[PDB]
Write a protein that binds this DNA or RNA. Structure first.
Lengths: 313, 126
RNA sequence: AACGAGACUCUGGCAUGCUAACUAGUUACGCGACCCCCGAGCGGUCGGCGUCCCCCAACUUCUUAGAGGGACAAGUGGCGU
């Protein structure tokens, strides 16, 4: 079966990498966020000396940047921050065209709609919130929301079932109808708080995880439970492959992949030892992205680096 | 210089960990946000000092016991050293040797018949 | 268990992020005016100098001052019953 190998590393940051984002429109570009308050745009290269260079940096947020996402045309990017404000960036000039305001705490995740005509967000303020791209808020979920911090929000990629999924510190996963503005279904099972939720590109399955170290699968349209996978110590991020039936997870200092035909671990990715006089000797992995080609993986870390892996035979 | 923490900081940090161990971790910037919603703290400068000692105590509790703090996860494995151990399926067996003056003490008590015997040294060890 | 200590109150150093100013400014131009040709090049569109003057132009970097943010011995290496 297929096996990963280390390609190279990217060095231009002064705090933990918080997220990475990519598109099929520009395969020599990637974009990433950090606790150093700024978003970096990278020029990738196939040169033997170093795999990429910081090309531009976006500087307008006043605390940490928590989430970042790119428009399907590759012209614009959207981001949230621990300063409680949400911003839309023109990637050609490196300037914000609009600013979104109306949360009263601290913003943990954001997404674009699959048509890119609507925006959604989640926060420590306990409210999910919906926005028009002209910067005006359109609905607020309030009493039916999570009882604790809203950790994540995501859209289904398909057009024929317009719904969103979410996870929170009250250890529930919830599913919501877009046009009707209402809750559809709870899912219950996890013992710890939740860090992440994700959906397969065919629009069929969820995955979710957090402190309990378990990845659990769920149906989007059949409304029911599927099998549980033990990850290890903790789950920081999850993603599906774009062209294989694989789930991938970032788990403490290591990254891991499951082949879902026959439910088996393909490989686990680890770091060369730097001897350290304390517990948690290695730095942890914080975020993942597969390239639009599917053949290469980007991963971010608490040691201010992005590490790149290829597939091999 | 002096960076020693006063009893107002050290007592509030212990009471937080007794009630909210499942919320906490190694990241100071996340602990600083948790301690602001589970407690009323009058000053920003006091909140930072409490979340600092909570972050120090979490890294100790990952290694072993701290005498002033208790949690279910550590009590139930104490309760597994309590009750019975995996060490052996039977007692240390009663087939043990007897000295001549213990043989004589048991003879006067109408007992014996199950022990081997040998004598000690010719004179008291010096 | 109580008072003193510490916390606490005022103050200094950071924010091209927020709120928004004819009793505070900048940039720019519809432009208008004086002086110099030193300037590719003319006595010019274009250059230089301005506490010289309008804006029914755009804006908040520099000034004012309200709200929040930020630092914890928090990170790494030694020494410590």
């Amino acid at each position: 079966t297929e096996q990963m190998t280390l390609r190279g590393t990217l060095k231009g940051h002064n705090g933990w990498v918080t997220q990475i984002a990519t598109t099929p429109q520009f395969p020599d570009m990637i974009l990433s966020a950090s606790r150093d308050k700024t978003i970096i745009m990278w020029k990738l290269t196939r040169d033997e000396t170093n795999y990429g260079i910081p090309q531009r940096a976006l500087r307008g947020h006043s605390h940490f940047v928590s989430d970042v996402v790119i428009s399907s045309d590759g012209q614009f990017a959207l981001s949230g921050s621990w300063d409680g404000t949400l911003r839309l960036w023109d990637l050609t000039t490196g300037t914000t065209t609009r600013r979104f305001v109306g949360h009263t705490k601290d913003v943990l995740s954001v997404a674009f709609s699959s048509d890119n005509r609507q925006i959604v967000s989640g926060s420590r303020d306990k409210t999910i919130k919906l926005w028009n791209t002209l910067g005006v808020c359109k609905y607020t979920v309030q009493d039916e929301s999570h009882s604790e911090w809203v950790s994540c929000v995501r859209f289904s990629p398909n057009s024929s079932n317009p719904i969103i999924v979410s996870c929170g510190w009250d250890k529930l996963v919830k599913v919501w109808n877009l046009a009707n503005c209402k809750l559809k279904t709870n899912h219950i099972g996890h013992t710890g708080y939740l860090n992440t939720v994700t959906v397969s590109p065919d629009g069929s399955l969820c995955a979710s995880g957090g402190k309990d170290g378990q990845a659990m699968l769920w149906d989007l349209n059949e409304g029911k439970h599927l099998y549980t996978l033990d990850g290890g110590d903790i789950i920081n991020a999850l993603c599906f492959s774009p062209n294989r039936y694989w789930l991938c997870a970032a788990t403490g200092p290591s990254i891991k992949i499951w082949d879902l035909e026959g439910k088996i671990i393909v490989d686990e990715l680890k770091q060369e030892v730097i001897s350290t006089s304390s517990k948690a000797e290695p730095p942890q992995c914080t975020s993942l992205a597969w390239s639009a080609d599917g053949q290469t993986l980007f991963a971010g870390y608490t040691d201010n680096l992005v590490r790149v892996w290829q597939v091999t035979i | 210089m002096g960076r020693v923490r006063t009893k107002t900081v050290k007592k509030a940090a212990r009471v937080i960990i007794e009630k909210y161990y499942t919320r906490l971790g190694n990241d100071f910037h996340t602990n600083k946000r948790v301690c602001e919603e589970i407690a009323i703290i009058p000053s920003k400068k006091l909140r930072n000092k409490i979340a600092g000692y909570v972050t120090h105590l979490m890294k100790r509790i990952q290694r072993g016991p701290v005498r002033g703090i208790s949690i279910k996860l550590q009590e139930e494995e104490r309760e597994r050293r309590d009750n019975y151990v995996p060490e052996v399926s039977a007692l240390d067996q009663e087939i043990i040797e007897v000295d001549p003056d213990t043989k004589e003490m048991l003879k006067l008590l109408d007992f014996g018949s199950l022990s081997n015997l040998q004598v000690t040294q010719p004179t008291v060890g010096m």
